[PDB]
Design a protein around this ligand. Structure first.
Ligand SMILES: [Cl-]
Ligand SMILES: [Cl-]
Lengths: 310, 313
């Protein structure tokens, strides 16, 4: 058993890049499924999906990331495990092919605890590079995913190259706890295991701590209405973003209990998603677009479905 | 009118640096009130208090921060404005005397408007240093919450982080929702609340404590609201279940208009101790206090909570 949902290229609809996004979202889902069918942890499955998403030269993450003001690459990525509730993140990272690998490495090391000090969950800049290299992570010469395994464990990750020409050192939502992604297994105050991954305007997602907000709203009965209400009230109409002339963001959501309800929503013109069940064979891709006449950054688009795992 | 509450060392108790902490806390409040009496914004008021705190060679922030694994100083700091709800932060910043100054400038610049594109609210490392210097900032855990006579609140925090930390390790003082929070009353929140945290960075981050405290302070009883958060959402937080002892502290203020302004302020911690300072513009007399856990109570397991009330204007 196992299910996976991924996203790439949220933003303005490209009647050309669309084909490319579908392609990589297809194989990102394939790799995630492979991992799960090989009995891998949900975090390694979501990590494998991100590596594939990052490696596509068309995605603003890993290889092909946007160059900053100095024509340099600085990447943000993070990952969260719903079972352990642990998290790993890197910000303004360069020199590493797959930022999500550094984040996942920080997560695993974090799960080992003081076995002789509380481990770091968030590293940035040169220090993040040295740390990655020191742990064997391949030093060179927005995308995301949510996963749930046969046991019902969930995981989420997000990776981005951030804004083109951004000032050096600028860190976005993909590196920030609660903002870029979230994953939380069922608990006393969490009737559902939920996983979230975001995309869009970094600052907008950060100010509203969107990822975590969606996870909390999703504890309600109606997943569809829960997400819609969040995108409308907690995002578009958030007082924290009142000064903004348009709110741009996208999110993919997974909720289980195995009954898996998966959804995606965005205020951007469009967003590409790919999803697959381990007992489904072949991933499905889809270019989600805002309804006709809907204004980007002022309206919402939401689609989804259900899936039963075994 | 105006009120300020500050802190400068939630951690081990030390009868030998306790007088040092009180001394700087008193001065920080005075600079905050002085700024407010001069007609400055709540944000400039909290910045001035933090500037004073950072400069103290006895605080783990700015001048005198803990050296990292390479023997260098890397600082984290953030500030938030309750009125505009804008935010500013810096992480792993070295070479700058007052990190909070950079955070404040990032916030001010953001308030001006889009650069083309929203300005950056969070910068780290060399990039943060470069932005600082190019904006006139001089090259070379503590916090504060403020409320002005009109009811606008602001909050900030500054830290040198974990001693001997790996370079580039960024903690709670740089993260939105974790290190500090400031939010004026609004449609959903009847109270203007401000929060600044301290303690084990990771514990504060995983629990997004500043924001959590602010949301809890919307309850009718502030003292009880804060206690439940420190106990249920921090010490007993599932996100920290694998930890043996949750260490951290927080100072909060909540105000509501009555014309007078009713200000309730509190401080709580699970650490052995924490030094705080507070002052009202009207009283013109800054006070300091070393909060300590009850005898027998266990650090990281117990919670100390104190506070008071103040009417402004
Ligand atoms: Cl992309
Ligand atoms: Cl200190």
């Amino acid at each position: 058993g196992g299910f996976v949902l991924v996203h790439a290229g949220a933003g303005y609809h490209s009647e050309s890049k669309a084909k490319e996004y579908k392609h990589v979202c297809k194989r990102a889902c394939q790799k995630a499924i492979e991992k799960l069918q090989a009995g891998a942890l949900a975090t390694d499955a979501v990590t494998a999906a991100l590596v594939e998403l990052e490696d596509s030269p068309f995605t603003n993450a890993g290889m092909g990331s946007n160059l900053n003001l100095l024509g340099e690459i600085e990447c943000d990525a993070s990952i969260m495990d719903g079972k352990s509730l642990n998290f790993g993140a890197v910000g303004a990272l360069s020199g590493i092919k797959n930022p999500v690998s550094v984040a996942n490495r920080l997560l695993c090391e974090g799960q080992k605890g003081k076995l002789g000090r509380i481990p770091p969950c968030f590293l940035v800049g040169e220090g993040a590079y040295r740390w990655a290299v020191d742990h064997g992570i391949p030093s060179c010469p927005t995308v995301g995913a949510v996963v749930v395994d046969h046991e019902g464990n969930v995981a989420a990750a997000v990776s981005s190259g951030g804004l083109a020409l951004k000032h050096p050192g600028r860190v976005g939502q993909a590196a920030l706890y609660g903002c870029g992604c979230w994953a939380e297994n069922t608990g006393a105050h969490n009737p559902y295991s939920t996983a979230v991954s975001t995309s869009g305007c970094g600052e907008h997602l950060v100010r509203t701590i969107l990822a975590r907000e969606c996870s909390h709203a999703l504890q309600a009965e109606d997943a569809h209405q829960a997400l819609l209400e969040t995108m409308q009230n907690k995002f578009i109409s958030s007082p924290f973003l009142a000064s903004e002339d348009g709110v741009l963001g996208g999110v993919i959501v997974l909720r289980s209990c195995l009954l898996v309800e998966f959804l995606w929503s965005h205020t951007t013109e469009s967003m590409c998603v790919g999803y697959m069940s381990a007992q489904d064979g072949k991933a499905k891709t889809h270019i989600s677009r805002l309804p006709p006449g809907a204004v980007a950054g002022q309206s919402v688009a939401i689609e989804g479905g259900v899936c039963r795992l075994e």
